[PDB]
Paper text:
We identified PBI1 (PUB44-INTERACTING 1), which belongs to a protein family with the DUF1110 domain. PBI1 interacts with WRKY45 and negatively regulates its activity. Therefore, it appears that PBI1 keeps WRKY45 in an inactive state in the absence of pathogen attack, and that PUB44-mediated degradation of PBI1 activates immunity via the de-suppression of WRKY45. PBI1 is degraded upon perception of chitin, and this is suppressed by silencing of PUB44 or expression of XopP, indicating that PBI1 degradation depends on PUB44.
Although PBI1 consists mainly of the DUF1110 domain, the molecular nature of this domain was unknown. Therefore, we determined its tertiary structure of PBI1. The crystal structure was solved at a resolution of 1.84 Å. PBI1 is composed of a four-helix bundle with a diameter of approximately 19 Å and a length of about 70 Å. There are six molecules in the asymmetric unit. The root mean square differences (r.m.s.d.) between each monomer are from 0.15 to 0.85 Å. We observed no large conformational change induced by crystal packing. The four helices of PBI1 are arranged in an up-down-up-down topology, and the bundle is leftward turning. The interfaces between the helices consist of hydrophobic residues, whereas hydrophilic residues are exposed on the surfaces that interact with the aqueous environment. In particular, the CC domain of Rx is very similar in structure to PBI1, with a high Z-score of 4.5.
Residue numbers in the entry: 3 to 187
The structure:
C-alpha cells in the first residue's frame, strides 16, 4: 500500500513520454512518403531510396519507443496486481479487482490495458509499412519490369495506409497514457 504506488506513477509518467516520442517519429516518417516514387531513371530511384531510408530510421525509433511503452505499461500493471494484493504470497487476478483504496491506480490500469492494445496494433502496422517500403526497394532495383512504377505506387499507397493506421493507434494510446498519468498525479 505504499512504495509500489510511486513506482507505478513513475512508470506511467515515463510511458506517456515514450508515447509522445512515438507520435513524433510516425508523423516525420509520413512526411517522407507523400510524393510519388519512380524507378525509370537512376537519379529518381536514388531519391526514392533516400526517402525510404529516412522513413525507415523514423520507424525504427517509433518501434523502439512503442516496445518501451508496452514494457513500462505492463510493469505498471504488475506493480498494482502484486502491490494491491491482500496476501503477500499472491497477486490479484486482474486490475478491476484492486481495492477501492487504490481507485487511482485502478482507473489508470484500465486505461493502460487498452493503451497496450493500441501499442500492439501500432507496432503491427509499423511492421506492415516497413514491409511495403522493403517491397519498393526491391522494385527500385528492377527498373525494366513492365509497369514497375504502378507497382511502386501500389506499395507506397499501402505503406501510407499502414502508417496512418499506426498514427491513429498512437493518438489513442497517447491519450490513454496521459489520462492514466492524470489519474495518478
Amino acid at each position: 500500500a505504499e512504495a509500489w504506488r510511486s513506482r507505478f506513477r513513475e512508470r506511467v509518467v515515463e510511458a506517456a513520454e515514450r508515447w509522445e516520442s512515438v507520435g513524433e517519429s510516425l508523423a516525420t516518417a509520413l512526411t517522407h512518403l507523400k510524393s510519388p516514387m519512380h524507378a525509370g531513371d537512376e537519379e529518381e530511384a536514388a531519391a526514392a531510396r533516400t526517402r525510404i531510408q529516412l522513413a525507415m530510421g523514423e520507424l525504427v525509433d517509433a518501434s523502439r519507443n512503442l516496445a518501451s511503452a508496452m514494457s513500462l505499461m505492463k510493469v505498471a500493471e504488475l506493480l498494482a496486481l502484486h502491490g494491491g494484493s491482500v496476501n503477500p504470497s499472491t497477486h490479484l487476478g486482474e486490475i478491476s479487482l484492486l481495492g477501492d483504496q487504490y481507485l487511482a491506480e485502478r482507473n489508470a490500469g484500465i486505461k493502460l490495458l487498452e493503451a497496450g492494445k493500441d501499442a500492439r496494433k501500432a507496432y503491427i502496422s509499423v511492421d506492415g509499412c516497413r514491409g511495403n517500403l522493403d517491397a519498393i526497394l526491391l522494385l527500385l532495383d528492377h527498373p525494366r519490369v513492365p509497369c514497375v512504377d504502378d507497382f511502386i505506387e501500389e506499395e507506397l499507397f499501402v505503406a501510407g495506409d499502414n502508417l496512418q493506421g499506426a498514427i491513429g493507434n498512437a493518438k489513442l494510446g497517447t491519450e490513454r497514457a496521459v489520462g492514466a498519468r492524470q489519474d495518478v498525479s
